[PDB]
Amino acid sequence: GAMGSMERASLIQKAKLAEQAERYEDMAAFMKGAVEKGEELSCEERNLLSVAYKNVVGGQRAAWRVLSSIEQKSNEEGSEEKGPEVREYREKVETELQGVCDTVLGLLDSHLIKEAGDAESRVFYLKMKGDYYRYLAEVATGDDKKRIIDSARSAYQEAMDISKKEMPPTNPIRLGLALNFSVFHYEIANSPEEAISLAKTTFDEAMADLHTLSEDSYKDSTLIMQLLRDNLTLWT
């Protein structure tokens, strides 16, 4: 595409610059270009890809929620009619969000997942697949909502199966996957008990493995464990 003429290494360098400048749309465009070179991504490069799109879609999600709340209030009793503009603008933001999700899912399907054979890379990408279907599910209201939800569930479940077989219970990717799949259960699948059980079991199994870790690995694992605890506190 537009980045076809730029060297892979230059795209990665500029993605790092864009991150420092908080230019996340640029960062995402650079990393899309890097993926489209066709080579596998290193750990650091996978992280850059995820950070860029997380920030872009995160801003879209926040805006969508603001607009959805205004729209909901406009449809209450006693609310004065203000015309189609709120719905139109919410739809505009929604369409842009769906476009970003489709772009990410397209990169994963063409061809990051199929060339990812190591457990750490495959789990990382399948977690992303689950996350971006989850974001599609957050805004879905039509006849494909069930299929969108099932796509998220399926991706998360494959990731979980691999992580449990191939990674230690303190591995940060495994922990972050479990954190997010637990949120999927609570917020998307209407399964709060499953969400709570998963967060608790994940936390406890990680706790029991901390003794094996260096100071630095301990810091990383305990940070994510605290996020599991925070959600458990919110939910109980």
Partner: peptide
Amino acid sequence: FPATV
């Protein structure tokens, strides 16, 4: 909203 990473 709950925490995700």
